[PDB]
Design a protein. Structure first.
Length: 123
């Protein structure tokens, strides 16, 4: 869910306030996501969005009637490293990995402030 994802970003980028810094960036970071990503950070978000669509196709998630946005997987942060819990079931594990990969991606790419709060007409 959102509370764990925001926690993961903070684990990798301890200087960030993710809800302020990563929401509404580019074409993908934020509600929706369409068009060509404007930069590598936006591609991180595009991959993440595609990860959630994929999770929705997993038999495990469908039979659990899961929502990736509300998924209650467990994770831990120590020394700025994220671990997804071994106790997670197949679907929760898939969502945790989507979130983990994105948080790492975010931490490895430049941030172009000119792409924050883009007009969607550029997407
Ligand atoms: Ca999105």
């Amino acid at each position: 869910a959102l509370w764990q994802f925001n926690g993961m970003i903070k684990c990798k980028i301890p200087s960030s306030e993710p809800l302020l810094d990563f929401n509404n960036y580019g074409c993908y970071c934020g509600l929706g996501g369409s068009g060509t990503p404007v930069d590598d950070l936006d591609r991180c978000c595009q991959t993440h969005d595609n990860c959630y669509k994929q999770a929705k196709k997993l038999d495990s998630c469908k039979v659990l009637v899961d929502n990736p946005y509300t998924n209650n997987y467990s994770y831990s942060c120590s020394n700025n490293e994220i671990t997804c819990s071994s106790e997670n079931n197949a679907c929760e594990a898939f969502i945790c990995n989507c979130d983990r990969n994105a948080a790492i991606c975010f931490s490895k790419v430049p941030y172009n402030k000119e792409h924050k709060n883009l007009d969607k007409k550029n997407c």
